[PDB]
Amino acid sequence: KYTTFQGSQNFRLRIVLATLSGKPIKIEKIRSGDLNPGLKDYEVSFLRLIESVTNGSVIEISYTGTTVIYRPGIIVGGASTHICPSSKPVGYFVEPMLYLAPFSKKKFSILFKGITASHNDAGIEAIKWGLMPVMEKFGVRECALHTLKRGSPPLGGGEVHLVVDSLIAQPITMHEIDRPIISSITGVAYSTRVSPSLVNRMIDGAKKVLKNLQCEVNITADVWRGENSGKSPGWGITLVAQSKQKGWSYFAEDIGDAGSIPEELGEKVACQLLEEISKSAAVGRNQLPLAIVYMVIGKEDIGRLRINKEQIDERFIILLRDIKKIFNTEVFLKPVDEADNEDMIATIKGIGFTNTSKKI
């Protein structure tokens, strides 16, 4: 019949996983007890986006809006434009599309319009330098996110273009059983509609915390001004720790609000990057969900991913339970033989997924 889920928890993931597995699902009791029950405007917007990038899908929303019945079709992709409601930035919509773009009949060329930054969702730089490198490790050679306009909250006005030229049969099998060595730290400090000195002061704070490290630190200053700078003023920073040896990366990001000091924000993100590194083994917590899913949809082979004891939190557990409900796949965790740390190897057998939408 349908695999039934509860609440709005992991709404995007469950829809994405159902699309990849092709298994019809039902999500019920979405915010039943709230004063405004049911789906939000951005969750309906996300369902419109799924309709546009697939064909033959049936999405039924209840009369009360508290139940969604999803019968997935085939991933087709193609060129389109999506207007993101102001309640969510573009990154809330681009992030799930990274799970579907490589396995499409045609190339994804989607133009997202609206706010390009927020406090809770992925930024442009997190996607460009933090998640999209992971896709490259798994076999997505050609994938890019072009920034046409920056739009800061609340008025936004930004514009980003997602192009994933690589259409692959499935992700490669991952074998990462070591702790990568960080070779350098990079990043982007950006601003819109405001003076360059805020970006400089962002960097001064970030260099301050990181200068004690033995590696090179090179943060870029992305000062947007003029017509392509959106409709609101704003600034932020995204620091990335890179491991050139095997193309792994760890990143942290945040944006500034009204009445905040740029130096303090630079110090905060610099401290968070060190916190993320300490909690990581091969990928960061904000990259782990993408890595796990891509390992599930590989060939019928055992992929290995080293994970730090800190990354097994409530988010990790709910992700694995959702995978087992949809895919019946169980992640097997074994300790590493070392005594320096308490890491574990997450071993996943792929399901033998194949991109059957692409013409041959």
């Binding site: 309709e51 697939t54 899908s57 049936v58």
Partner: peptide
Amino acid sequence: KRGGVIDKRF
């Protein structure tokens, strides 16, 4: 174009 979103919300 086959399939679609059937919105029944009040």
